[PDB]
Scaffold this active site. Structure first.
Site, PDB file in Angstrom:
ATOM      1  N   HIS B  41       0.810  -1.220   0.000  1.00 35.78           N
ATOM      2  CA  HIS B  41       0.000   0.000   0.000  1.00 35.78           C
ATOM      3  C   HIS B  41       0.857   1.291   0.000  1.00 35.78           C
ATOM      4  O   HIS B  41       0.287   2.379  -0.024  1.00 35.78           O
ATOM      5  CB  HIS B  41      -1.082   0.018   1.083  1.00 35.78           C
ATOM      6  N   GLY B 143       2.162   5.577   9.971  1.00 38.50           N
ATOM      7  CA  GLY B 143       3.530   5.431   9.485  1.00 38.50           C
ATOM      8  C   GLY B 143       4.286   4.224  10.030  1.00 38.50           C
ATOM      9  O   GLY B 143       5.438   4.003   9.647  1.00 38.50           O
ATOM     10  N   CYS B 145       3.556   1.080   9.432  1.00 36.04           N
ATOM     11  CA  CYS B 145       3.513   0.001   8.460  1.00 36.04           C
ATOM     12  C   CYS B 145       4.904  -0.314   7.909  1.00 36.04           C
ATOM     13  O   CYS B 145       5.716   0.594   7.680  1.00 36.04           O
ATOM     14  CB  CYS B 145       2.487   0.277   7.370  1.00 36.04           C
TER      15      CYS B 145
HETATM   16  C1  LIG Z   1       0.227   1.789   8.309  1.00 35.68           C
HETATM   17  N1  LIG Z   1       1.144   2.692   8.437  1.00 35.68           N
HETATM   18  C2  LIG Z   1      -1.132   2.001   8.893  1.00 35.68           C
HETATM   19  C3  LIG Z   1      -1.129   1.484  10.313  1.00 35.68           C
HETATM   20  C4  LIG Z   1      -2.421   1.832  11.022  1.00 35.68           C
HETATM   21  C5  LIG Z   1      -2.531   3.319  11.387  1.00 35.68           C
HETATM   22  C6  LIG Z   1      -3.434   3.286  12.604  1.00 35.68           C
HETATM   23  N2  LIG Z   1      -3.038   2.073  13.282  1.00 35.68           N
HETATM   24  C7  LIG Z   1      -2.426   1.175  12.401  1.00 35.68           C
HETATM   25  O1  LIG Z   1      -1.967   0.071  12.662  1.00 35.68           O
HETATM   26  N3  LIG Z   1      -2.040   1.234   8.067  1.00 35.68           N
HETATM   27  C8  LIG Z   1      -3.070   1.853   7.394  1.00 35.68           C
HETATM   28  O2  LIG Z   1      -3.272   3.061   7.391  1.00 35.68           O
HETATM   29  C9  LIG Z   1      -3.950   0.887   6.648  1.00 35.68           C
HETATM   30  C10 LIG Z   1      -3.827   1.016   5.163  1.00 35.68           C
HETATM   31  C11 LIG Z   1      -5.070   1.663   4.662  1.00 35.68           C
HETATM   32  C12 LIG Z   1      -5.959   1.965   5.824  1.00 35.68           C
HETATM   33  N4  LIG Z   1      -5.339   1.253   6.975  1.00 35.68           N
HETATM   34  C13 LIG Z   1      -5.850   0.934   8.232  1.00 35.68           C
HETATM   35  O3  LIG Z   1      -5.141   0.387   9.073  1.00 35.68           O
HETATM   36  C14 LIG Z   1      -7.282   1.290   8.563  1.00 35.68           C
HETATM   37  N5  LIG Z   1      -7.904   0.028   8.974  1.00 35.68           N
HETATM   38  C15 LIG Z   1      -8.703  -0.675   8.081  1.00 35.68           C
HETATM   39  O4  LIG Z   1      -9.013  -0.275   6.975  1.00 35.68           O
HETATM   40  C16 LIG Z   1      -9.183  -2.023   8.532  1.00 35.68           C
HETATM   41  F1  LIG Z   1     -10.208  -1.986   9.418  1.00 35.68           F
HETATM   42  F2  LIG Z   1      -9.749  -2.700   7.505  1.00 35.68           F
HETATM   43  F3  LIG Z   1      -8.172  -2.812   9.000  1.00 35.68           F
HETATM   44  C17 LIG Z   1      -7.397   2.422   9.576  1.00 35.68           C
HETATM   45  C18 LIG Z   1      -8.866   2.747   9.748  1.00 35.68           C
HETATM   46  C19 LIG Z   1      -6.697   3.661   9.040  1.00 35.68           C
HETATM   47  C20 LIG Z   1      -6.865   2.108  10.957  1.00 35.68           C
HETATM   48  C21 LIG Z   1      -4.681   0.286   4.124  1.00 35.68           C
HETATM   49  C22 LIG Z   1      -4.182   0.229   2.723  1.00 35.68           C
HETATM   50  C23 LIG Z   1      -5.427  -0.939   4.557  1.00 35.68           C
END
Ligand SMILES: *C(=N)[C@H](C[C@@H]1CCNC1=O)NC(=O)[C@@H]1[C@@H]2[C@H](CN1C(=O)[C@@H](NC(=O)C(F)(F)F)C(C)(C)C)C2(C)C
Ligand SMILES: *C(=N)[C@H](C[C@@H]1CCNC1=O)NC(=O)[C@@H]1[C@@H]2[C@H](CN1C(=O)[C@@H](NC(=O)C(F)(F)F)C(C)(C)C)C2(C)C
EC number: 3.4.19.12
Lengths: 301, 302
Positions: B41, B143, B145
């Protein structure tokens, strides 16, 4: 989201760990530049530990009675001196992995990361709070002495603790990096007690803020309290009195959640007087006091 | 003495963390030999994340669209490919700090250390258990990830986890180092749910052994039980059924303490039936299931 007990990355400290042997006693040393720091009881036999005279024991040791090993290479000791309860061994080589560092004396309530080591090899990493009675609740086995506690500010390692003993209760005691014990303890195998411990009030408040940030709100209400009224109540439950300096340190968490410090104090006063009614806070049935406001800010911002 | 939630020393993994940027999205990568591994992503905008077609996004990116930075050293991307939910970026320099390593897929119940990173810089280390529903209870901000989970066997790093997203319940999900999600999740910003969770019974027993080793014996009783009688009670309290393989893994702790596994099962059965009545074990008011028999032996003997 989430809230976990987290340690600093241990890498810069791992490059400083060495094995120090003297006769049949082996423990860990901390190699910074051309000096290796270690607990002075490495010069004791099992017998000597009961009632040592360290000055008489050190006089019988030459530089060649100290075997220092860094990985597989032996470091020659060219000088030695005793500073309080630590031994300083000057070596012929400066550690090329010496990071930027400072020696600090931490205060009660403050936290640090421990790199637990055996035979100079890092084994584990965990976080400790220095208890108000100057003990820590660690995990240490035989040969763990010389293991250090530290904090990291960007690229600088602040060393605040070196492990020496375990008290009868199972809690742990040690020194700053100048060999001065934290607490009323001596490096002698004799029964020693720590004072009655108390709950770190400012740390429980910091943890209640981390909980609200994470979505726990059941313990909140519109009640407030003066600092004095909270203190009159808190001290009945063996909690430390909250000072203005503590309130000021909670300021950034208060600003982030929109909950005034004295409003969180009123919620804590209620939690102590009523209990948790079968409910949890951050997956816990007890109130937690081992996270400082700084630990919560670093993880919730 | 002492029993603490302990992470593995992170130095070997710290030397592999890098910052990966694609356009305006920035996250962490794992640099091993001449390859950088990161969540796919990184090629998404915030809008793309709602419903990505990763193949159509990847086709629009070239090697020069990926900025990889190790400290202040900019690395040159000379190849790129997608494997499941992970991007592999071939770089023109092998990481000289690459430790001896392997990529494993861990099973539910097992633990690992997480090195949480932001902008390619290590920030903190903690221990997680892979829950039976394939989630972890971590601590991750925006950030994070690309942050990785791992175990260490002497000098070899076993990488088992890469961080990708947080579920609506506040729990965390991610992949192995081949890009395969642990659990029924996809890397798309859409409401997804994990299965109902269960308590890791073998880990609760390991932690009870850790408590006895440490002096906590109040819960020990003079009774024994059979595997089947314990399992009838376990199913009622949403605990996993104990197998012979799990009994076999508890053997070393059983030998160290001199307490039979079926003698410890009888203590557990009574703690579940009667409850804990406000009492504590190892300073906890609740039964702990995030320590494996291996974490207990590693900490309580050597
Ligand atoms: C990576 N840096 C982040 C880590 C997130 C930030 C909040 N806590 C975490 O662990 N990952 C993301 O932003 C991913 C990314 C898009 C949206 N996302 C999510 O983690 C979202 N969760 C979901 O969509 C769910 F429920 F399906 F797991 C969010 C609502 C922002 C927490 C992608 C591509 C999945
Ligand atoms: C350092 N390698 C060990 C660490 C201990 C071993 C068990 N768990 C630990 O944290 N240090 C010692 O063995 C020191 C050492 C002699 C005895 N000692 C103790 O820690 C003992 N404790 C005390 O005498 C007490 F209560 F005062 F703290 C022991 C009973 C072995 C736990 C010397 C020189 C103090």
């Amino acid at each position: 989201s989430g809230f976990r007990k987290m340690a600093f990355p241990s890498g810069k400290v791992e490059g400083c760990m060495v094995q120090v042997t003297c006769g049949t006693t082996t423990l860990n040393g901390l190699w910074l530049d051309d000096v290796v720091y270690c607990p002075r009881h490495v010069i004791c036999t099992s017998e000597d530990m009961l009632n040592p005279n360290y000055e008489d024991l050190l006089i019988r040791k030459s530089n060649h009675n100290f075997l220092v090993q860094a990985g597989n290479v032996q470091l020659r000791v060219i000088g030695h001196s005793m500073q309080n309860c630590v031994l300083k061994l000057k070596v012929d080589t400066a550690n090329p992995k010496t990071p930027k560092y400072k020696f600090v004396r931490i205060q009660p309530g403050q936290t640090f990361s421990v790199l637990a080591c055996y035979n100079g090899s890092p084994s584990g990493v965990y976080q400790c709070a220095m208890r108000p009675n100057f003990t820590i609740k660690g995990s240490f086995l035989n040969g763990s002495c010389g293991s250090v506690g530290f904090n990291i500010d960007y690229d600088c390692v602040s060393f605040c603790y070196m492990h020496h003993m375990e008290l009868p209760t199972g809690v742990h005691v040690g020194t700053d990096l100048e060999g001065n014990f934290y607490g009323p303890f001596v490096d002698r195998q004799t029964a020693q007690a720590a004072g009655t411990d108390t709950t770190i009030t400012v740390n429980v408040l910091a943890w209640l803020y981390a909980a609200v940030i994470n979505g726990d709100r059941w313990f909140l209400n519109r009640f407030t309290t003066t600092l004095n009224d909270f203190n009159l109540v808190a001290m009945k439950y063996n909690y430390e009195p909250l000072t203005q300096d503590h309130v000021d340190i909670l300021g950034p968490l208060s600003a982030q959640t929109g909950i005034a410090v004295l409003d969180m104090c009123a919620s804590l006063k209620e939690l102590l007087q009523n209990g948790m009614n079968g409910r949890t806070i951050l997956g816990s049935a007890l109130l937690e006091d081992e996270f400082t406001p700084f630990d919560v800010v670093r993880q919730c911002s």
